[PDB]
């Protein structure tokens, strides 16, 4: 009898006793673009009142919370759920098609069959974590000296490098690696070039950090990747 | 001891383990003789778990044996759920078997305790394999009435 | 339909083997009985049959496209005059 | 694009559904006695690769 909106108890307050109001037809569904009733309550004294933002047809076809839109089974954003878990196909993003899908899905879904069962949801969660753990575990000579000497003069089967003392992996990994070798200024990097250049407040920290040497390095777009292919022949 | 079950999907043939558990099969035999099972829904279908049915009301509760309310089961060690098709009975307590039964679709070694085993389906197993693929609502209940037309004992 | 039947080539090595093999161990129900047969739902053919399906369909389509194909100012007027000629020339 | 491009994108007007985000009216075939099952799910790779 237009009784309740579905809200999880994380954003329903830690009090088992709360009061809320409804304003019928108070907003257009942010997905259905449909006239829907609003519900306002207080999570806890001292913060701004919450309110429901999506209709009852949604957050049910999505099995989600009308206010926080965290999925009611796992508790992480429904967008990330449908992007990574990929349980069942979602709707479009354009206006007319999205509202058409919302209307027809609400119709065929109130006919009685449920579009969301949690058994397959947990199965897909375990499948995703399994795939994650699975993820966890003369032509070369001519493209070698073709341009290295050119740049070296301009601004400076097997190949073995030299070690000099002249005075997938994000950048924060570099940040928490060099912090014990001296203060950091900026870490400029590029995955394609695979070259990460750091700067310190003093050259003494740089030289003491570089002395730790015996995967590591010591001192256009495609134009910077010529020496990155040396990784294939390192 | 032999009972043919003219179910709605097809034909189920069952042989009763009179030699193993005599008391639990006599009621079934005389119950097929009376044949009040006509027009009884298979109210419960769980994929790869069971197909339960046998109640006149069709609400998943009730069903009177010849003893009238309930009887005492008899179990022995060599009975096991090692296969897919064992015909067993249904209960809701220590010794509370009623007129309904079910057919196994998978090894259930954890269910061989308070639960009696009294049948092995010799033919019509395909029918149960398809019963495992029946339209089911949120509860383990088929949407359309999965009645049994009629059953002869033979 | 009966033209298509006239262009059919049945009786491969499959049908006789299917008639003779599973009939020997017919403990219950016959392979040809269909009053209460269940397996006919799950008949998934082989590659050769589907291939001949596609070639027959393509040949028939090509056959259709093959057989299907100054009093006037334009080509439509021409087609209209030929229609007029078809209907009124008798009168 | 021949020499050096800024990756030109074609311009859409403001009031079209664009017919390129999903099926324009999104109607699925009715399911019948014979189960499709594998006929499309065994060959999702085909649905992408014939394309």
């Amino acid at each position: 009898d237009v009784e309740f909106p579905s809200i999880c108890e994380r954003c329903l307050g830690d009090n088992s006793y709360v009061r809320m109001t409804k304003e019928p037809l108070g907003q257009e569904c942010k997905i259905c673009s449909k006239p829907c009733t609003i519900f306002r309550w207080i999570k806890e004294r001292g913060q701004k009142p919450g309110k429901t933002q999506i209709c009852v047809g949604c957050a049910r076809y999505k099995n989600c919370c009308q206010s926080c839109m965290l999925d009611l089974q796992f508790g992480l954003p429904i967008a990330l759920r449908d992007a990574a878990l990929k349980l069942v196909e979602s709707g479009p993003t354009n206006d007319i098609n999205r509202e058409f899908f919302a209307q027809n899905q609400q119709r065929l879904l109130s006919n009685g069959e449920t579009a969301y069962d949690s058994q397959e949801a947990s199965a897909a969660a375990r499948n995703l974590v399994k795939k994650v753990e699975k993820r966890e575990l003369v032509e070369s000579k001519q493209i070698l000296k073709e341009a290295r000497a050119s740049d070296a003069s301009l601004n400076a089967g097997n190949v073995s490098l030299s070690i000099n003392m002249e005075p997938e992996l994000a950048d924060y990994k570099i940040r928490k690696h060099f912090e014990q070798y001296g203060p950091l200024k900026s870490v400029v990097c590029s995955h394609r070039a695979k070259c990460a250049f750091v700067n310190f407040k003093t050259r003494s920290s740089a030289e003491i950090a570089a002395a730790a040497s015996p995967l590591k390095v010591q001192w256009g777009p495609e134009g910077e990747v010529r020496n990155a292919k040396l990784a294939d022949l390192v | 001891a032999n009972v043919e079950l003219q179910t709605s999907l097809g034909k189920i043939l069952i042989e009763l383990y009179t030699e193993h558990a005599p008391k639990t099969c006599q009621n079934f035999y005389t119950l097929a003789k009376e044949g009040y099972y006509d027009g009884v829904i298979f109210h419960r279908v769980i994929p790869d778990f069971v197909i339960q049915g046998g109640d006149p009301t069709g609400t998943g509760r009730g069903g009177t044996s010849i003893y009238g309310d309930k009887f005492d089961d008899e179990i022995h060690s060599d009975l096991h759920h090692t296969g897919a098709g064992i015909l067993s009975m249904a209960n809701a307590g220590p010794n509370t078997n009623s007129s309904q039964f079910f057919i196994t679709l998978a090894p259930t070694p954890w269910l061989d305790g308070k639960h009696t085993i009294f049948g092995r389906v010799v033919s019509g197993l395909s029918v149960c394999k398809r019963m495992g693929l029946i339209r089911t609502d949120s509860s383990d209940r088929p949407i359309e009435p999965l009645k049994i037309i009629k059953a002869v004992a033979l | 339909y009966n033209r298509g039947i006239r262009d059919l080539k049945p009786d491969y090595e499959k049908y006789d083997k299917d008639k003779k093999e599973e009939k020997s161990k017919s403990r219950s129900v016959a392979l040809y009985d269909e009053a209460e047969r269940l397996d006919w739902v799950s008949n998934k053919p082989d590659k050769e049959h589907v291939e001949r399906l596609v070639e027959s369909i393509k040949k028939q389509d090509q056959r259709r496209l093959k057989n299907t194909k100054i009093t006037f100012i334009n080509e439509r007027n021409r087609k209209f005059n030929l229609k007029l000629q078809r209907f009124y020339s008798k009168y | 694009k021949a020499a050096g491009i800024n990756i030109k994108l074609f311009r859409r007007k403001k009031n079209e559904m664009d017919y390129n985000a999903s099926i324009p009216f999104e109607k699925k075939p009715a399911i019948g006695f014979y189960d499709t099952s594998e006929e499309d799910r065994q060959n999702f790779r085909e649905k992408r690769e014939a394309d």
């Binding site: - | 003219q6 179910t7 097809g10 693929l133 089911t136 037309i149 | - | 006695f33 014979y34 099952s37």
Partner: peptide, 21 residues
């Protein structure tokens, strides 16, 4: 095995002895 009912239930032995419905 996770197929659910991806297809309609097969025809029924109707109560009027009709073989297939």
């Amino acid at each position: 095995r996770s197929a659910k009912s991806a297809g309609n239930t097969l025809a029924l032995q109707v109560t009027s002895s009709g073989a297939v419905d």
